[PDB]
Design a protein around this ligand. Sequence first.
Ligand SMILES: *OP(=O)(O)OC[C@H]1O[C@@H](n2cnc3c(N)ncnc32)[C@H](O)[C@@H]1O
Lengths: 76, 79, 992, 152
Amino acid sequence: LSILVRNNKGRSSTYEVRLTQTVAHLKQQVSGLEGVQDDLFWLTFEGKPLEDQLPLGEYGLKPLSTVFMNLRLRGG
Amino acid sequence: DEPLSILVRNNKGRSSTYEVRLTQTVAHLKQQVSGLEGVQDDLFWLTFEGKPLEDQLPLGEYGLKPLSTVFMNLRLRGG
Amino acid sequence: VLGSPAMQRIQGARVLVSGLQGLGAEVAKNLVLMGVGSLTLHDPHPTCWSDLAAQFLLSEQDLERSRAEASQELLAQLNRAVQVVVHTGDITEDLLLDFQVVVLTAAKLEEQLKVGTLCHKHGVCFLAADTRGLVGQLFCDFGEDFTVQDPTEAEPLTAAIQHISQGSPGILTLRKGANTHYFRDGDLVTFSGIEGMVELNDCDPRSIHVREDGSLEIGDTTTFSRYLRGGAITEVKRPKTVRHKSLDTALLQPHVVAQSSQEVHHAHCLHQAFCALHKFQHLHGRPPQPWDPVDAETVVGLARDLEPLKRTEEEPLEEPLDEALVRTVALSSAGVLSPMVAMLGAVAAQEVLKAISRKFMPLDQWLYFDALDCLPEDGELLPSPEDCALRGSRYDGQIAVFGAGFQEKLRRQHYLLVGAGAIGCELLKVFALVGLGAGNSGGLTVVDMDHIERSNLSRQFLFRSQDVGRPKAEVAAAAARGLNPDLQVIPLTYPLDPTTEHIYGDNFFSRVDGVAAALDSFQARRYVAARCTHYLKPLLEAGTSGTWGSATVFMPHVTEAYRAPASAAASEDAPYPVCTVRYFPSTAEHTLQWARHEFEELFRLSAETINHHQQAHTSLADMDEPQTLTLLKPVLGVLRVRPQNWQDCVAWALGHWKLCFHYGIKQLLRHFPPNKVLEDGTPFWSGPKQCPQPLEFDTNQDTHLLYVLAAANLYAQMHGLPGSQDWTALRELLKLLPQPDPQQMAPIFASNLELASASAEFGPEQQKELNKALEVWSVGPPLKPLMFEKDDDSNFHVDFVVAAASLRCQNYGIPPVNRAQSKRIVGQIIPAIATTTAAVAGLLGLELYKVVSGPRPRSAFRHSYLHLAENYLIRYMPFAPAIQTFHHLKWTSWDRLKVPAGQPERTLESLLAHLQEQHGLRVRILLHGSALLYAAGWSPEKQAQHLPLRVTELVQQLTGQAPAPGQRVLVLELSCEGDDEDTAFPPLHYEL
Amino acid sequence: MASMRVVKELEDLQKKPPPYLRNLSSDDANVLVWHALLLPDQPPYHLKAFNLRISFPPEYPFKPPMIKFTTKIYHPNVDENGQICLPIISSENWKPSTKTSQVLEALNVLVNRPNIREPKRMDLADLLTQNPELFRKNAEEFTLRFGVDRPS
Ligand SMILES: *OP(=O)(O)OC[C@H]1O[C@@H](n2cnc3c(N)ncnc32)[C@H](O)[C@@H]1O
């Protein structure tokens, strides 16, 4: 099934992401395709922050998840 | 055509004597108030005798007699 | 805000609340929430049915019981500090002597006069509030001498001192700002921060004289010492005194609070009507029957019989009594409403706190709130005695004013409460008591994406203390269902933002009959208003700040659409400039954000730099790894090995402070002299308003130590070693070590033989040292990043950032941070006051009555704005919708262009032709969101490549997305040939 | 919506492009992203061209556009990431009235006349004010190493 993936720059570019596959192996590919440092922004659905040690099944990633990232840091 | 001196009242218990004219506009009054109080025009409005003031009408329609207090009301965001 | 002087007096005060009907329950609830120490209730009358439509504490099972005793349990449960007791005797002099405030809510004139006389005799502040249908009444008498100590809802002023000279006037000049115009002659000022003029600090407050060109003076300063630089000048408030006439005297010559003269006349008519109602109650024993024509005539006859000389003789009334007003008030004076109760209870509790804390200007003995507009219009059918007759349901209080038909219309509704923080919770209480969606054909919905916090539950009644963590939506839904058992709340956790447009779209917004948005931001309010305009839904919006409040209704096509303050909406989420961060935080706010972002970049990124990035794929060969390691590692100690020493000491804190202020300022001075610019040579002004000095730490001063403590505690918490609060013993330890720096001056700067390090002279030795430190940290324990948490005081975030900001501002001569700037900061925000929250909730409830009533003219609706500190309340009918026009096309801010697609989906050419002919407009730009579809300056080849296609296919080709399954319309923004850069054409709804 | 204003601005500026800016383009997919080739006048930047990327947030014109030098450029107040500290772009001098044309003119002025008042690269600003000869050396090297060929 299709899950809405969006970028903070105004382009969605939905990608094939499934629950049967780990979220890390998909977010790494998305970050590589985009070209922006992952540490700049944390992917987050419905307002739940994602951690390096956080099971996704506890929070229950909904289909068509409202996943978006928030810009942080101060590069310049 | 004669000028008058109204007292615009700030939202923090302060007043200021602005020198305006009955042929001016509430937009001009808002600009002067904004300039003096360091506030944006779209962030505040101003009222007189309960009723608010549309920023497209001359101040003469609204009955601003000299020595009048035009209150300044801020748009509130807290919920 | 939370002022310790006033709060000390708040807890030590005792207030009696007699006549605990709905209004008394509202007043008592607000007092308990605000934190009144003791609360003696008094209402021995048995609970009736009509008390269940306005009072939330009493339930259906509390029938035939004393209202005070029944409400005592819930009122005590609301806040445990408040000691809510119940008095079962009678109001006697001995009882009245002990209390500090006495509030008679909905009590007869006899008891009002008796208790008022008794209280005014000795020392007791007295209030007498009463709601009779849709008209309220408040009287406040605070004795013959009541001294308020702070007559404004504003912090004392402060201004940066530029220079002061000596002489007979002692004229001093200050930096340009709004404070220059704010300051006025005859005021009172004090001084606390100044370099030079040593004993002028802590001196007596003194007057000033305002001269032209912003010139001020203090007096005689010639005898004093030399002045170097000026920190700040602070204004001082002048305590005011008020004398209030007693009740028996003021009842004859009322002094109403109003913002006009016609409103004063209206309030005089209302006062005559209330006196007539009291005289009727004394002459007949029973209140006027619900909407009884006979009783209304008797009441108006009594109003005429009331002495025309009872009015003041120095200003005759322009017209005799308003028979229509008195008759309407008598007719609707049967029941008691929930919104009106909330509004009057909010005002009465604010007055009680005014009396208790001797703060803010008190009410001038009379206030009358008129909300008769909620009644049906003249043409429509006014409710009859037959349907206003009580039946036995909980809503018979509302029925006796509005009618069973209106009650059923309220019952059969679907609404959407977006946001349930504080105004949302009180709007939920109002909805539950009113009966909005309590039937089987109706319902409710609560949307919230937050979780209850210990800070939020402080002044909120729906949320308890055992619910910290559970969703606000779910808790508020449970509370509302507990309040009204027949209600059907559907808590939704997903927020209302552009990302969540697939959940809350078409199918969702098709069932809702209205929207009530109690939000805490401007962008969210603008988005919700945009959705409500797109779906043509009524919207009720409230907003509070301190004692300010605003309540507005935006009914489609009758009232102006909600427009947000775009400036503030952008300011909500906007970065700050970096020039002030680097070299000139001209104000305490820039030095505050510098401290915040410096701490963020030094700690949050430290966690990722020690382990993740270094150990995953990169090394020091990245863009600049040595700089990132230098900004965190050496400043926190040489380390380079696993630290076996305790992570709670002062050895590295002082070195960090040296590098943060003294070394930084010295390095800046070496970069350029404070008085000259090397490139300019001979500039227009040599060193204009910039003279930074390096700071030396003093152990005695509190700011330096508090910064040290905060840094040490946070570093211990961050490294993971158990950190102990230094305020007991380790502060004394750092005081015991007064001179750790002289033995470690040179080596702590950089390595061992780098006094200044020149330019990139660290070399391979230092590079390898940094790499070894990175490897040691990678093999060591991982530091855990921490976020800004106001609730947890142990992290020492707010104190640390405030101390750093104060230190740097004093280094730069900037006046120190004040509490006002911290409050204005989005973080560390104070909760809204329960009084203003209840006021806006009640006003929104009245707007809900008007909305639910049905098709109503614009003049029926009212937007309200209040300020309780100044007792300034306005309720004004809103403007007509704006009418914008271009050529022959005319439109407003609500309407939309609706072009159909057709069974064969039309092409770009077809749509363009349809527009151009049907609405007579030549489109130049056709945008879908941020996707162009057809320009006019486009090359003919591009036009002939895009035009033959069809709109739905073109959107697909450009975006890369697919048409939504179940999509109904496509919104496209169109421009026109020869149009101004301001004209906003109505959105085009391509009906696919 | 800011998108219509940005489209109008780009269409207005395309018919009369400034001399220092060429191929001011944007994708129809996302019209809030302008791609441009800054062409300096004052050496050594006068040799090559630099591709920049202007991004307009949806709060425009109440939120300053973000300018990032996609091409690596040797400027005392331009970071290697391409960020720029233009005084008008900073959120203290921004007004909705100021246009992207004026912003780009100020950017050209900044590039042609290196700034030291607000150094984004304070280290390299110090090297500039000390040894401008070494600065021209590194400037020429970086221009000839990263700069895009100057179009006709
Ligand atoms: O009472 P309060 O001023 O704290 O109100 C804040 C509440 O509003 C909710 N909120 C804020 N913004 C939104 C959006 N966009 N959608 C849904 N709810 C929203 C907060 O969650 C809080 O409960």
